[PDB]
Paper text:
In the Firmicutes phylum, GpsB is a membrane associated protein that coordinates peptidoglycan synthesis with cell growth and division. GpsB is a DivIVA-like protein that is highly conserved in Firmicutes. The full-length Sa GpsB is a relatively small protein of 114 residues. Its N-terminal domain homodimerizes as a coiled-coil, while its smaller C-terminal domain homotrimerizes, forming a hexamer as the biological unit. Dimerization of the N-terminal domain is facilitated by a pattern of nonpolar residues every three to four residues, promoting the formation of a hydrophobic core in the coiled-coil. This N-terminal domain is partitioned into three regions: a relatively short α-helix with approximately two turns (residues 10–16), a second longer α-helix (residues 28–70) that forms a coiled-coil, and an amphipathic 10-residue loop (residues 17–27) that links these two helices and intertwines with the adjacent protomer, ‘capping’ GpsB.
Using X-ray crystallography, we solved the structure of the N-terminal domain (residues 1–70) of Sa GpsB at 1.95 Å resolution in the P21 space group, with four monomers per asymmetric unit forming two dimers (dimers A and B). The overall structure of GpsB is similar to previously determined GpsB orthologs and retains the same fold of DivIVA, though it shares much less sequence similarity. The most unique structural feature of Sa GpsB is a hinge forming at the midpoint of its N-terminal domain that causes each protomer to bend, adopting pitch angles (θ) of 137–140° (dimer A) and 156–166° (dimer B). In contrast, GpsB protomers from Lm, Bs, Sp, and Sa DivIVA are almost linear (θ=167–179°) and practically indistinguishable when superimposed. We find that there is a 3-amino acid insertion in the Sa GpsB sequence where the helicity is disrupted and that a cluster of four Met residues (Met45, Met48) are interlocked at the dimer interface at this position (dotted rectangle). These Met residues are only found in Staphylococci and take the place of an aromatic Tyr or Phe present in other orthologs, which normally stabilize the core via π stacking interactions. While the 3-amino acid insertion likely disrupts the continuity of the coiled-coil, methionine is one of the most flexible aliphatic amino acids and may further contribute to the conformational flexibility. Experiments using solution state NMR spectroscopy further support the notion of intrinsic conformational heterogeneity, suggesting it is a bona fide structural feature rather than a crystallization artifact. By extending the asymmetric unit, we found each GpsB dimer coordinates two others in a head-to-head arrangement. This involves the insertion of Arg and Lys residues from the membrane-binding loop into the PBP-binding site from the adjacent GpsB protomer, mimicking the binding mode observed between PBP mini-domains and GpsB in orthologous structures, such as Bs PBP1.
Numbering used by the authors:
A (entry chain B): 0 to 70
B (entry chain A): 5 to 70
The structure:
């Protein structure tokens, strides 16, 4: 569908992501992992919105048609 | 409805460590992608609201002329 958006990542991609570890100055893993868990919850919430836009668009079209068919 | 915004992710800093931390360039590059995705999710959320609002309105217009 034309309305479809294409995300770079998915909930599962982020959940599976394995960063290189270093003994150089890097990021505390526990803080990055905890932040990604919130991000995963957000991706999951939004995952079906391509379909939700199509459905709303299609009902929108039907309703406008009924209305015009009155007047 | 979302726990975070693109801005929250854009502005996030992590504590530094010498003790087997994550490579910063890899994490940064990965969050750059998540920030772009959050912009697309905000646009689609806005679209779902506009369409749900329009659909409610169209139903009320049909109902009042019934």
């Amino acid at each position: 569908h034309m309305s479809d958006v294409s995300l770079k990542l998915s909930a599962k991609d982020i959940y599976e992501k394995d960063f290189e570890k270093t003994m150089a100055r890097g990021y505390r893993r526990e803080e990055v992992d905890a932040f990604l868990d919130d991000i995963i919850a957000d991706y999951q919430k939004m995952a079906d919105m391509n379909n939700e836009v199509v459905k709303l668009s299609e009902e929108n079209h039907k309703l406008k048609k009924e209305l015009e068919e009155l007047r």
